[PDB]
Amino acid sequence: KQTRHLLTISALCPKELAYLIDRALDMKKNPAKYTARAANKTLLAFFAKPSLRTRVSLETAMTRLGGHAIYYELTVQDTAEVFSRMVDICTARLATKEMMREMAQHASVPCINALDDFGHPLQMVCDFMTIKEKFTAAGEFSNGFKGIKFAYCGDSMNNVTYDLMRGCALLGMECHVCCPDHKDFKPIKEVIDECEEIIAKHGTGGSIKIFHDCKKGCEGVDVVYTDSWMKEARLKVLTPFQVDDAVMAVTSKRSIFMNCLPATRGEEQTASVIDGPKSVCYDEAGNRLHSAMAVLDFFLHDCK
Amino acid sequence: KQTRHLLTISALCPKELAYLIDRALDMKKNPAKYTARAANKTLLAFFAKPSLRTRVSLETAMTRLGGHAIYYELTVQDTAEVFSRMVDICTARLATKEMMREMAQHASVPCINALDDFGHPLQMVCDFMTIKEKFTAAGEFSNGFKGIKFAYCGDSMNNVTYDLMRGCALLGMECHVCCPDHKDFKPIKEVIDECEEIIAKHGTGGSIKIFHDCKKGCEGVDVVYTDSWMKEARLKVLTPFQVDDAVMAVTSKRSIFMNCLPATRGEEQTASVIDGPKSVCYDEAGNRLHSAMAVLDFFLHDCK
Amino acid sequence: KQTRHLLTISALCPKELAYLIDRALDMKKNPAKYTARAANKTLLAFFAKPSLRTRVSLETAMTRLGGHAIYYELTVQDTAEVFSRMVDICTARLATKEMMREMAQHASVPCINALDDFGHPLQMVCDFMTIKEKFTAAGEFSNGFKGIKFAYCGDSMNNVTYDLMRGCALLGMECHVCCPDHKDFKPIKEVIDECEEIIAKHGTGGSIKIFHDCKKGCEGVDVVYTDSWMKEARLKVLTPFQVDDAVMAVTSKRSIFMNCLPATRGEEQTASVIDGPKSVCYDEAGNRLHSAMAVLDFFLHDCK
Ligand code: NI
């Protein structure tokens, strides 16, 4: 209460998200500067289920800043009341947004959702950082994020899709959500409404469009992003949304391909796309590190 | 052998316990001074069962001192012989005092009992530190610990009660143990004898009194402390020892209420006491951190 | 690919192994010098099964160098591709040489085998360091490793025996392998061939001899080393290779006894040998620490 949390990426205003991106980018390039930013400070990091990516980037981020992360494998008020008088910051990877919200409710140090059924803001700072990084080096970033057309393909009733839509809205991107015309695979109306309100409120110039044909949705786009599809006959509804060569063939000449991982080479995309030349997946996953250092640093302090 | 351990709080003489309290208090207030006290030094921390409180305070304490704790989740001679040539200090949370004593026997670095069936000295430095802190800020500490009347309510055949009785004896406090007149719920004679001997030997001016009526036991007292009661018909014997509003109504006007946690709101106390205005429980649990830094620091060196 | 790994000790040329030994020895004696060698740098440490020795020495080594180890309890390409853009170095304790080789294949930071079915190079730097240390203090090291006759007793189809044979070949020692004349308990021909080739290629002056009588094999030797034998009637084949008092009575007057641990007092050796006066086992196990700091430091950089 009055402590700032990060339960979704829209916990940030547009300039805060753009500051975090640039800070991540400067910590990537100039780590020697940040080497004592969290000296003697600790992050308490709950995981209800392992994620190599999340755990290694978090634990490494703190070492690079000169502090330490407690890997804590799994009353909540009492727990939160008690850790907030010991640790400086907390991330938690819990099943539902409920447990995450409950913990944050009573916590008096910043709490960061390290993935739940409603968002994944650590990934969001990672991905938009990767997009700025990639396009800037190719000299395609004169128009900033504004000119980068983004498409998400696949199961779109999805915490990752929710948070990408929010990042795009915040950053003023054209976001296309390419999903099966099926109630169980589309973004939730609440999430669309949040996005259209944040673009309205900040006049970001962003837009949200829902396509039910990935090729039509991906025509002209600069980023194609997909993620894990995981009786298993979601496959019949999802298969037309596999990112393949014909899908990538309709995108811009500058396009890049992203997937937050774990990747399954014959589900959400073909091995030829992920292992092909438009794929930024591994550099994107490494960027979890630098985007984590930026987020922790910022919540450890708060400004700028 | 010839290495100093901390298996109970009476491993310390009265001035060492009072030094640890003041060091904890100064590390609370002035952490910047202690920031390199354990630089490059590691604590090996065994847990046979998780305790969020114990683990987070230990791991955080070392970071704050600039060192590191190995969270080690679970021959003992060979183990201890081997870790004593690698690590600088060791804490262990093991089932019985036996395993703890065995490990310490062969260990050649300091070993600290992080909770067993016979004591909890890390909690003891925490609690007496909290008592000094609270009463000092209220201006009720002119007579030091000497004037603070202390009462423990509940199941008193209990490692926590044992170690509170020892802390009180050491510090020269009037300690009242409020328990059911029942062989299975009273302090053990060995523990009473140790306490009466330490007060005798140091002329501490402390006293130990056993009451079988918590209200009678708590009349006039300045601290009321209870802890977890956990077929489950210990409840019929324990219920007259619940710390409720009528119990707290007989204590001093300055009194405070303590519980080392986990708290169960309708067992050892009512929700109105723990969530009411005399409760110091959460600040007390946070003080695990600073009392841990003091204990580790001291055993890492030894003097003063 | 083009990243240097350490999957066996023969990943090192003879001078690199001798440099690591001397560095370990200088870090033992002068730790204050090495206190910022891994500042802000992290080691990712996978364990498919706990080893107190391996885990504590690794985690402590990094703290002493000023960095941090992630204890990671257990696609491999994707995993390795991803951790190589976050962490600085990796050790892994995996079942087979296969998984270890697979991980290393795709990894772009140094990977170190922390024990598999084919080697144990962290132990190797430990043991030869212990041998140099012990004999140097006794003034028995004028002839360096060259004059120290080494014998391994026991089950010799063994990753530890493999890597000792390699260390000896590298260092130019007479190595005697004392094993049961039984296909399942002898070194593998591939390992003998590697050793005879490394001595040939570097003209180390080392030799490999296979004895089927431990007393005959140990006659005159300066080091007797054994390790864990673990329906359980391997005991009938192994029992003539128990290191007992009559075995140690045939060695040099300067001899020492080694066992990498865990020790079972009535299997691979008698309690009188391991607890007797020739035993260096515990100082040897503590030396895991300093030999770990040397190996990590070296792979973190690479030269000298
Ligand atoms: Ni750690």
Side-chain angles (χ1 to χ4, degrees), chain A residues 55 59 63 68-71, chain B residues 59 63 68-71, chain C residues 55 59 63 68-71:
Chain A
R55 214 252 264 215
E59 230 168 309
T63 303
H68 188 247
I70 295 174
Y71 166 68
Chain B
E59 230 168 309
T63 303
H68 188 246
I70 295 174
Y71 166 68
Chain C
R55 214 252 264 215
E59 230 168 309
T63 303
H68 188 246
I70 295 174
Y71 166 68

PDB file of all heavy atoms in Angstrom, chain A residues 55 59 63 68-71, chain B residues 59 63 68-71, chain C residues 55 59 63 68-71, ligand 1:
ATOM      1  N   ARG A  55      14.914 -18.042 -13.091  1.00  0.00           N
ATOM      2  CA  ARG A  55      15.795 -18.191 -11.961  1.00  0.00           C
ATOM      3  C   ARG A  55      17.221 -17.736 -12.241  1.00  0.00           C
ATOM      4  O   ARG A  55      17.829 -17.040 -11.421  1.00  0.00           O
ATOM      5  CB  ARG A  55      15.836 -19.632 -11.488  1.00  0.00           C
ATOM      6  CG  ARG A  55      16.010 -19.708  -9.997  1.00  0.00           C
ATOM      7  CD  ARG A  55      17.379 -20.190  -9.626  1.00  0.00           C
ATOM      8  NE  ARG A  55      17.304 -21.611  -9.398  1.00  0.00           N
ATOM      9  CZ  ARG A  55      18.011 -22.281  -8.498  1.00  0.00           C
ATOM     10  NH1 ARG A  55      18.871 -21.672  -7.688  1.00  0.00           N
ATOM     11  NH2 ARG A  55      17.830 -23.588  -8.425  1.00  0.00           N
ATOM     12  N   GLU A  59      18.979 -14.430 -10.355  1.00  0.00           N
ATOM     13  CA  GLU A  59      20.069 -14.703  -9.441  1.00  0.00           C
ATOM     14  C   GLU A  59      21.362 -14.026  -9.987  1.00  0.00           C
ATOM     15  O   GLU A  59      22.117 -13.399  -9.245  1.00  0.00           O
ATOM     16  CB  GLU A  59      20.230 -16.241  -9.265  1.00  0.00           C
ATOM     17  CG  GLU A  59      20.290 -16.684  -7.785  1.00  0.00           C
ATOM     18  CD  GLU A  59      20.160 -18.174  -7.535  1.00  0.00           C
ATOM     19  OE1 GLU A  59      19.191 -18.821  -8.046  1.00  0.00           O
ATOM     20  OE2 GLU A  59      20.997 -18.700  -6.776  1.00  0.00           O
ATOM     21  N   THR A  63      23.777 -10.640  -8.606  1.00  0.00           N
ATOM     22  CA  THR A  63      25.258 -10.711  -8.516  1.00  0.00           C
ATOM     23  C   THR A  63      25.903  -9.592  -9.310  1.00  0.00           C
ATOM     24  O   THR A  63      26.900  -8.985  -8.882  1.00  0.00           O
ATOM     25  CB  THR A  63      25.760 -12.068  -9.020  1.00  0.00           C
ATOM     26  OG1 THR A  63      25.119 -13.095  -8.247  1.00  0.00           O
ATOM     27  CG2 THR A  63      27.289 -12.203  -8.875  1.00  0.00           C
ATOM     28  N   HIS A  68      22.341 -10.039  -3.804  1.00  0.00           N
ATOM     29  CA  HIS A  68      22.122 -11.509  -3.706  1.00  0.00           C
ATOM     30  C   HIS A  68      20.649 -11.821  -3.823  1.00  0.00           C
ATOM     31  O   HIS A  68      19.839 -11.064  -3.323  1.00  0.00           O
ATOM     32  CB  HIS A  68      22.602 -12.045  -2.357  1.00  0.00           C
ATOM     33  CG  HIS A  68      22.579 -13.541  -2.284  1.00  0.00           C
ATOM     34  ND1 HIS A  68      21.732 -14.233  -1.447  1.00  0.00           N
ATOM     35  CD2 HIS A  68      23.248 -14.473  -2.998  1.00  0.00           C
ATOM     36  CE1 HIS A  68      21.890 -15.530  -1.633  1.00  0.00           C
ATOM     37  NE2 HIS A  68      22.810 -15.708  -2.565  1.00  0.00           N
ATOM     38  N   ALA A  69      20.315 -12.952  -4.475  1.00  0.00           N
ATOM     39  CA  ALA A  69      18.944 -13.437  -4.542  1.00  0.00           C
ATOM     40  C   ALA A  69      18.840 -14.743  -3.785  1.00  0.00           C
ATOM     41  O   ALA A  69      19.670 -15.647  -3.973  1.00  0.00           O
ATOM     42  CB  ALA A  69      18.515 -13.681  -6.021  1.00  0.00           C
ATOM     43  N   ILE A  70      17.804 -14.829  -2.955  1.00  0.00           N
ATOM     44  CA  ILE A  70      17.451 -16.044  -2.255  1.00  0.00           C
ATOM     45  C   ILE A  70      16.483 -16.825  -3.148  1.00  0.00           C
ATOM     46  O   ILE A  70      15.384 -16.377  -3.447  1.00  0.00           O
ATOM     47  CB  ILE A  70      16.740 -15.738  -0.957  1.00  0.00           C
ATOM     48  CG1 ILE A  70      17.689 -15.002  -0.001  1.00  0.00           C
ATOM     49  CG2 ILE A  70      16.258 -17.035  -0.307  1.00  0.00           C
ATOM     50  CD1 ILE A  70      17.006 -14.516   1.317  1.00  0.00           C
ATOM     51  N   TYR A  71      16.906 -17.988  -3.587  1.00  0.00           N
ATOM     52  CA  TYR A  71      16.036 -18.823  -4.338  1.00  0.00           C
ATOM     53  C   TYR A  71      15.118 -19.571  -3.337  1.00  0.00           C
ATOM     54  O   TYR A  71      15.552 -20.464  -2.566  1.00  0.00           O
ATOM     55  CB  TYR A  71      16.857 -19.749  -5.219  1.00  0.00           C
ATOM     56  CG  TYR A  71      16.009 -20.861  -5.763  1.00  0.00           C
ATOM     57  CD1 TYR A  71      15.009 -20.594  -6.684  1.00  0.00           C
ATOM     58  CD2 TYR A  71      16.189 -22.181  -5.326  1.00  0.00           C
ATOM     59  CE1 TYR A  71      14.181 -21.611  -7.169  1.00  0.00           C
ATOM     60  CE2 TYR A  71      15.373 -23.216  -5.800  1.00  0.00           C
ATOM     61  CZ  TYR A  71      14.369 -22.915  -6.731  1.00  0.00           C
ATOM     62  OH  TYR A  71      13.555 -23.925  -7.240  1.00  0.00           O
TER      63      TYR A  71
ATOM     64  N   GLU B  59      20.274 -15.900   5.434  1.00  0.00           N
ATOM     65  CA  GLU B  59      20.790 -15.665   4.102  1.00  0.00           C
ATOM     66  C   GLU B  59      20.955 -14.130   3.892  1.00  0.00           C
ATOM     67  O   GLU B  59      21.966 -13.662   3.369  1.00  0.00           O
ATOM     68  CB  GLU B  59      19.842 -16.312   3.051  1.00  0.00           C
ATOM     69  CG  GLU B  59      20.581 -17.203   2.027  1.00  0.00           C
ATOM     70  CD  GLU B  59      19.702 -18.083   1.159  1.00  0.00           C
ATOM     71  OE1 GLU B  59      18.829 -18.835   1.698  1.00  0.00           O
ATOM     72  OE2 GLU B  59      19.917 -18.070  -0.069  1.00  0.00           O
ATOM     73  N   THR B  63      24.455 -11.525   3.482  1.00  0.00           N
ATOM     74  CA  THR B  63      24.555 -10.498   2.414  1.00  0.00           C
ATOM     75  C   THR B  63      24.817  -9.126   3.004  1.00  0.00           C
ATOM     76  O   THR B  63      25.606  -8.329   2.467  1.00  0.00           O
ATOM     77  CB  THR B  63      23.272 -10.471   1.577  1.00  0.00           C
ATOM     78  OG1 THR B  63      23.059 -11.789   1.046  1.00  0.00           O
ATOM     79  CG2 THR B  63      23.368  -9.464   0.414  1.00  0.00           C
ATOM     80  N   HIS B  68      28.196 -14.730   2.374  1.00  0.00           N
ATOM     81  CA  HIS B  68      27.217 -15.592   1.652  1.00  0.00           C
ATOM     82  C   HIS B  68      26.830 -16.768   2.516  1.00  0.00           C
ATOM     83  O   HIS B  68      27.670 -17.287   3.226  1.00  0.00           O
ATOM     84  CB  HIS B  68      27.823 -16.145   0.362  1.00  0.00           C
ATOM     85  CG  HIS B  68      26.820 -16.858  -0.492  1.00  0.00           C
ATOM     86  ND1 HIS B  68      26.877 -18.214  -0.731  1.00  0.00           N
ATOM     87  CD2 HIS B  68      25.696 -16.415  -1.098  1.00  0.00           C
ATOM     88  CE1 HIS B  68      25.840 -18.576  -1.465  1.00  0.00           C
ATOM     89  NE2 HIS B  68      25.109 -17.503  -1.710  1.00  0.00           N
ATOM     90  N   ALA B  69      25.553 -17.190   2.434  1.00  0.00           N
ATOM     91  CA  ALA B  69      25.085 -18.393   3.108  1.00  0.00           C
ATOM     92  C   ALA B  69      24.695 -19.425   2.073  1.00  0.00           C
ATOM     93  O   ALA B  69      23.974 -19.112   1.113  1.00  0.00           O
ATOM     94  CB  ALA B  69      23.842 -18.082   3.996  1.00  0.00           C
ATOM     95  N   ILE B  70      25.162 -20.650   2.299  1.00  0.00           N
ATOM     96  CA  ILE B  70      24.782 -21.799   1.508  1.00  0.00           C
ATOM     97  C   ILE B  70      23.545 -22.419   2.163  1.00  0.00           C
ATOM     98  O   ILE B  70      23.585 -22.891   3.291  1.00  0.00           O
ATOM     99  CB  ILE B  70      25.876 -22.843   1.503  1.00  0.00           C
ATOM    100  CG1 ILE B  70      27.126 -22.289   0.805  1.00  0.00           C
ATOM    101  CG2 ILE B  70      25.395 -24.099   0.777  1.00  0.00           C
ATOM    102  CD1 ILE B  70      28.361 -23.242   0.871  1.00  0.00           C
ATOM    103  N   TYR B  71      22.440 -22.398   1.454  1.00  0.00           N
ATOM    104  CA  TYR B  71      21.270 -23.040   1.943  1.00  0.00           C
ATOM    105  C   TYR B  71      21.399 -24.555   1.637  1.00  0.00           C
ATOM    106  O   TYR B  71      21.341 -25.010   0.466  1.00  0.00           O
ATOM    107  CB  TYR B  71      20.042 -22.397   1.322  1.00  0.00           C
ATOM    108  CG  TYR B  71      18.825 -23.248   1.537  1.00  0.00           C
ATOM    109  CD1 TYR B  71      18.303 -23.414   2.811  1.00  0.00           C
ATOM    110  CD2 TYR B  71      18.216 -23.915   0.465  1.00  0.00           C
ATOM    111  CE1 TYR B  71      17.196 -24.239   3.037  1.00  0.00           C
ATOM    112  CE2 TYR B  71      17.104 -24.743   0.668  1.00  0.00           C
ATOM    113  CZ  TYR B  71      16.600 -24.892   1.968  1.00  0.00           C
ATOM    114  OH  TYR B  71      15.481 -25.691   2.200  1.00  0.00           O
TER     115      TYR B  71
ATOM    116  N   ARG C  55      29.379 -29.453  -3.831  1.00  0.00           N
ATOM    117  CA  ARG C  55      28.569 -28.270  -3.698  1.00  0.00           C
ATOM    118  C   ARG C  55      29.176 -27.221  -2.776  1.00  0.00           C
ATOM    119  O   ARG C  55      29.185 -26.029  -3.103  1.00  0.00           O
ATOM    120  CB  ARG C  55      27.184 -28.614  -3.185  1.00  0.00           C
ATOM    121  CG  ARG C  55      26.146 -27.696  -3.767  1.00  0.00           C
ATOM    122  CD  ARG C  55      25.619 -26.738  -2.743  1.00  0.00           C
ATOM    123  NE  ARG C  55      24.405 -27.292  -2.200  1.00  0.00           N
ATOM    124  CZ  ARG C  55      23.348 -26.590  -1.814  1.00  0.00           C
ATOM    125  NH1 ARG C  55      23.313 -25.265  -1.914  1.00  0.00           N
ATOM    126  NH2 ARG C  55      22.315 -27.253  -1.325  1.00  0.00           N
ATOM    127  N   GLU C  59      30.488 -23.474  -4.125  1.00  0.00           N
ATOM    128  CA  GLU C  59      29.740 -22.320  -3.673  1.00  0.00           C
ATOM    129  C   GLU C  59      30.682 -21.414  -2.823  1.00  0.00           C
ATOM    130  O   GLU C  59      30.700 -20.193  -2.974  1.00  0.00           O
ATOM    131  CB  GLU C  59      28.486 -22.787  -2.878  1.00  0.00           C
ATOM    132  CG  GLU C  59      27.177 -22.118  -3.354  1.00  0.00           C
ATOM    133  CD  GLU C  59      25.892 -22.728  -2.826  1.00  0.00           C
ATOM    134  OE1 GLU C  59      25.694 -23.979  -2.933  1.00  0.00           O
ATOM    135  OE2 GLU C  59      25.044 -21.948  -2.349  1.00  0.00           O
ATOM    136  N   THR C  63      32.427 -17.451  -3.496  1.00  0.00           N
ATOM    137  CA  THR C  63      32.399 -16.389  -2.457  1.00  0.00           C
ATOM    138  C   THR C  63      33.798 -15.883  -2.163  1.00  0.00           C
ATOM    139  O   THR C  63      34.024 -14.675  -1.975  1.00  0.00           O
ATOM    140  CB  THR C  63      31.753 -16.916  -1.172  1.00  0.00           C
ATOM    141  OG1 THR C  63      30.437 -17.390  -1.498  1.00  0.00           O
ATOM    142  CG2 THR C  63      31.644 -15.818  -0.095  1.00  0.00           C
ATOM    143  N   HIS C  68      29.602 -15.525  -7.210  1.00  0.00           N
ATOM    144  CA  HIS C  68      28.428 -16.273  -6.679  1.00  0.00           C
ATOM    145  C   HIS C  68      28.189 -17.513  -7.507  1.00  0.00           C
ATOM    146  O   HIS C  68      28.375 -17.471  -8.709  1.00  0.00           O
ATOM    147  CB  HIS C  68      27.160 -15.422  -6.745  1.00  0.00           C
ATOM    148  CG  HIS C  68      25.996 -16.058  -6.050  1.00  0.00           C
ATOM    149  ND1 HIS C  68      24.876 -16.494  -6.722  1.00  0.00           N
ATOM    150  CD2 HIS C  68      25.815 -16.396  -4.754  1.00  0.00           C
ATOM    151  CE1 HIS C  68      24.042 -17.060  -5.869  1.00  0.00           C
ATOM    152  NE2 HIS C  68      24.581 -17.008  -4.663  1.00  0.00           N
ATOM    153  N   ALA C  69      27.760 -18.610  -6.853  1.00  0.00           N
ATOM    154  CA  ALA C  69      27.364 -19.827  -7.548  1.00  0.00           C
ATOM    155  C   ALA C  69      25.882 -20.056  -7.346  1.00  0.00           C
ATOM    156  O   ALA C  69      25.381 -19.975  -6.214  1.00  0.00           O
ATOM    157  CB  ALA C  69      28.140 -21.060  -6.992  1.00  0.00           C
ATOM    158  N   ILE C  70      25.207 -20.361  -8.451  1.00  0.00           N
ATOM    159  CA  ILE C  70      23.816 -20.756  -8.443  1.00  0.00           C
ATOM    160  C   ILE C  70      23.772 -22.279  -8.292  1.00  0.00           C
ATOM    161  O   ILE C  70      24.240 -23.022  -9.145  1.00  0.00           O
ATOM    162  CB  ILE C  70      23.141 -20.400  -9.748  1.00  0.00           C
ATOM    163  CG1 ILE C  70      23.109 -18.875  -9.921  1.00  0.00           C
ATOM    164  CG2 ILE C  70      21.715 -20.950  -9.765  1.00  0.00           C
ATOM    165  CD1 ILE C  70      22.556 -18.408 -11.305  1.00  0.00           C
ATOM    166  N   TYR C  71      23.221 -22.739  -7.193  1.00  0.00           N
ATOM    167  CA  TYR C  71      23.048 -24.139  -7.017  1.00  0.00           C
ATOM    168  C   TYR C  71      21.772 -24.559  -7.792  1.00  0.00           C
ATOM    169  O   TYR C  71      20.620 -24.218  -7.423  1.00  0.00           O
ATOM    170  CB  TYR C  71      22.990 -24.460  -5.533  1.00  0.00           C
ATOM    171  CG  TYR C  71      22.474 -25.850  -5.306  1.00  0.00           C
ATOM    172  CD1 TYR C  71      23.228 -26.949  -5.687  1.00  0.00           C
ATOM    173  CD2 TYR C  71      21.210 -26.063  -4.737  1.00  0.00           C
ATOM    174  CE1 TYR C  71      22.743 -28.251  -5.523  1.00  0.00           C
ATOM    175  CE2 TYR C  71      20.707 -27.359  -4.560  1.00  0.00           C
ATOM    176  CZ  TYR C  71      21.492 -28.450  -4.957  1.00  0.00           C
ATOM    177  OH  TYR C  71      21.030 -29.752  -4.774  1.00  0.00           O
TER     178      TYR C  71
HETATM  179 NI    NI D   1      23.507 -17.772  -3.017  1.00  0.00          NI
END
